[PDB]
């Protein structure tokens, strides 16, 4: 269950940083439960073990995976009752996160990075000790690598690697 934790925290996050740097560009930052269900990968790894068709149900899996955020203070809890359920975004957060990634790659120089080091690294920087499996997924990881490429910070090589079965 902790490796599903982590999973769905991590989609979590990608949606959250999103809604983030949405907001922060069309202008404190407030997000809804109803603006964080709207993504693909989060119902689709919900549905894995909850049935979250009805809208409602949905929400209420949000609600109970967004408690961890809110204890890390990434979220503060704006609005209570639904249909009006809010979270209010720590900016500095998730700039520390930002911070952290940068510094991790380009401290790596010419050597370069994968994706299990920075998530390693940046797992361990965090220190989340109040929480029991890992917020920082591989799915998340990838979206601030290709945030970071989007924004000429970092090149990406994709190097496949084949190994004959014995």
Known sequence: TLKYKELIAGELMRITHKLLIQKLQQQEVIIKIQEIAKDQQLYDTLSIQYQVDQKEQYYAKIAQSLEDFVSISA???????????????????????????????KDRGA???????????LTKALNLQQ????????????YLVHLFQDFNIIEIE???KFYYKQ
Do not use: R, W
Not at 111 to 121: A, E, I, S, T, V
């Open 75 to 105: 979220l503060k809890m704006v609005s209570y009752i639904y249909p009006n359920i809010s979270y209010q975004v720590s900016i500095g957060f998730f700039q520390n996160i930002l911070d952290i990634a940068t510094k991790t790659v």
């Open 158 to 160: 994709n190097e496949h």
């Open 131 to 142: 929480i029991s499996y890992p917020l920082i997924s591989e799915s998340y990881i990838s």
């Open 111 to 121: 050597l370069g990075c994968n994706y299990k080091y920075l998530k390693d690294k």
